[PDB]
Amino acid sequence: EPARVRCSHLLVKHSQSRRPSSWRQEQITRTQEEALELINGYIQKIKSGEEDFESLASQFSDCSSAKARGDLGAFSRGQMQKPFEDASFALRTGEMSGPVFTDSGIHIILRTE
Numbered sequence: 244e245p246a247r248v249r250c251s252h253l254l255v256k257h258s259q260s261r262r263p264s265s266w267r268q269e270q271i272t273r274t275q276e277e278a279l280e281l282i283n284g285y286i287q288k289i290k291s292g293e294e295d296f297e298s299l300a301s302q303f304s305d306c307s308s309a310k311a312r313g314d315l316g317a318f319s320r321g322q323m324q325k326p327f328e329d330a331s332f333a334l335r336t337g338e339m340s341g342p343v344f345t346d347s348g349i350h351i352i353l354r355t356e
C-alpha cells in the first residue's frame with residue numbers, strides 16, 4: 244500500500260448528515276434514501292459514459308472540493324473518516340468505488356494516484 248493515495252470524490256449529503264449544508268445549498272433537505280438514489284444514478288451514468296465523474300463532481304458534490312472538480316489531493320491513513328479511508332486505499336489507480344458511507348454523507352470515490 245503506498246504511503247498516500249490521491250483521490251477525487253463526489254459527496255451527496257442528506258438531512259441526517261453531520262453538517263447538513265454545503266457551498267451549493269444553504270440547507271440539505273433531501274432524505275438518506277434520495278441521496279443514495281442520486282449516488283446510484285451518477286454511478287450508472289458514469290459507467291454508461293453519459294456523464295463525466297469530475298463534471299458531475301464540480302456541479303453536484305456537497306463537498307467544497309467541487310471547485311477543484313472533486314479533487315481532495317493526497318492523504319495517508321489516519322486523516323479521513325475510516326469508511327472513506329478504507330474504500331480509497333482499496334481502489335486501484337483509475338478505479339471508481341460504489342456507494343461509500345461516512346457521517347458526512349454518501350460518497351463515490353475515484354482514485355487518481
Ligand SMILES: O=C(N[C@@H](COP(=O)([O-])[O-])Cc1ccccc1)c1cc2ccccc2s1
Pocket residue numbers: 252254261262305306307308314315316323324327345346347
Ligand atoms: O473533509 C472534507 N470535506 C468534507 C465536508 O463534509 P462536512 O465536514 O461538512 O461534513 C467531506 C469529506 C468527508 C470524507 C472524506 C472527504 C471529504 C475535505 C474537503 C477538502 C477540500 C479540498 C482538499 C481537501 C479536503 S478534505
